[PDB]
Amino acid sequence: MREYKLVVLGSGGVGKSALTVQFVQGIFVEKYDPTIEDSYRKQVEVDAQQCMLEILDTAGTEQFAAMRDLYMKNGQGFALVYSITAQSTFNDLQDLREQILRVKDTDDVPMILVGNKCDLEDERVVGKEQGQNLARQWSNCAFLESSAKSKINVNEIFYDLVRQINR
Ligand X SMILES: Nc1nc2c(ncn2[C@@H]2O[C@H](COP(=O)(O)OP(=O)(O)NP(=O)(O)O)[C@@H](O)[C@H]2O)c(=O)[nH]1
Longest pairwise C-alpha distance within the chain: 43
- Residue 10 annotated as part of some ligand binding site: yes
Taking CB under 5 A as the rule, does residue 58 contact Mg ion? no
Residue 153 or residue 164: which is nearer to ligand X going by CB?
153
Q: Which stretch binds Mg ion (CB under 5 A): 13-21, 87-95, 104-112, 142-150?
A: 13-21
Q: Is 20 in the site for Mg ion (CB under 5 A)?
A: no
Give the β-pairing of 49-58 and 37-46: antiparallel
What torsion, rounded to 10 degrees, do the Cα atoms 118, 150, 17, 24 define?
Answer: -140
137 or 155, CB closer to ligand X?
Answer: 155
Handedness of CA 12, 55, 156, 106 (dihedral sign): positive
Residue numbers 17-46 binding ligand X by CB under 6 A: 17-18, 29-32, 34-35
Q: DSSP code of 147? A: B
> Is 147 annotated as contributing to ligand binding?
yes
127 is in an annotated binding site: no
Residue 35 touching Mg ion (CB under 5 A): yes
Characterize the bridge pairing of strands 142-145 and 111-116.
Answer: parallel
- Return the closest-CA partner of residue 139 out of 115, 106, 167: 106
Q: Count the residues of the shown chain that bind Mg ion, applying the rule CB under 5 A.
A: 3
- Contact residues: ligand X, CB under 6 A: 12-18, 29-32, 34-35, 59-61, 116-117, 119-120, 147-149
